């Protein structure tokens, strides 16, 4: 992990947001 670190929790929103970032190829 580098992306974001855990605070909150981990795979945030974000580095796996039911997409990650914006892919869907």
Do not use: D
């Not at 992306?3 to 990650?20: I, M, N, R, T, V």
Request: proline content about 0%; aromatic content about 16%; glycine content about 16%.
């Amino acid at each position: 992990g580098w992306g974001s670190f855990f605070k909150k929790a981990a795979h945030a929103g974000k580095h796996a947001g039911k997409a990650a970032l914006t892919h869907y190829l």
